[PDB]
Amino acid sequence: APEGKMDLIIMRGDKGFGFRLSGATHAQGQWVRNVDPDGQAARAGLQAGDRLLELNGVDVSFWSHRKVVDEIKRSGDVVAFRIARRLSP
């Protein structure tokens, strides 16, 4: 499996960013399990399977699921992700 990295910027919607994060409760890191096709993440091009590498220019690949989620919720109206994406698929 070869992957490529990409940077993403997502404005918060009124129900959030619009995706379900999933992964290590306590590297490799959390990952995007599904994304609201009408939500803000889909609009910025987050896709299922995207694996979270950086949150607001901070390496977050080795964190707990809740520290990542909490900081995502605390990011305010905008968030930035760097992610790793399967390339062959």
Binding site: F17, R20, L21, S22, G23, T25, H65, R66, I72
Partner: peptide
């Protein structure tokens, strides 16, 4: 799952 959350 291992740990899931909507954001």
């Amino acid at each position: 799952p291992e740990s899931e959350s909507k954001v």
